[PDB]
Design a binder for this molecule. Structure first.
Ligand SMILES: CC(=O)N1c2ccc(C(N)=O)cc2[C@H](Nc2ncc(Cl)cn2)C[C@@H]1C
Length: 126
């Protein structure tokens, strides 16, 4: 079975927390990015089988996607904002590592990342 298991969105052994920053990441940051015209490739784990990209998970060993981030936030999976911001950064970095510059998916990621950075700049104080 060529796809790996997706990243966990819950873990009963991982301490859970709600902070005003994590509330902002779900209510403002994720919601803004999720509805974007370019969001759809990022809304679920890369299906490297269906995309016929057998090398994707040979190259990308820390996969991440906004579907996973959305469920982690809804589940209060995170302890802090940094864990969630790290997942967004991983999602973007994976896209830039795997794909060639100028690819449609790269321009799409760049547009979402510019919007992500705008919203992260307005992160409230804890
Ligand atoms: C996120 C990422 O790097 N990739 C990805 C993931 C999911 C989906 C998809 N079809 O859901 C598609 C892609 C990318 N392919 C693509 N082709 C055309 C357009 Cl208009 C947008 N993307 C490749 C890449 C592995």
């Amino acid at each position: 079975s060529m796809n790996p298991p997706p990243p966990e969105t819950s873990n009963p052994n991982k301490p859970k927390r709600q902070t005003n920053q994590l509330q902002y990441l779900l209510r403002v940051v994720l919601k803004t990015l999720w509805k974007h015209q370019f969001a759809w490739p990022f809304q679920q784990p890369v299906d490297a089988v269906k995309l016929n990209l057998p090398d994707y998970y040979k190259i990308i060993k820390t996969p991440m996607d906004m579907g996973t981030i959305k469920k982690r936030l809804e589940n209060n999976y995170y302890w802090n904002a940094q864990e969630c911001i790290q997942d967004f950064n991983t999602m973007f970095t994976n896209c830039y590592i795997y794909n060639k510059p100028g690819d449609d998916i790269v321009l799409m990621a760049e547009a979402l990342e510019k919007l992500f950075l705008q919203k992260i700049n307005e992160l409230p104080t804890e």
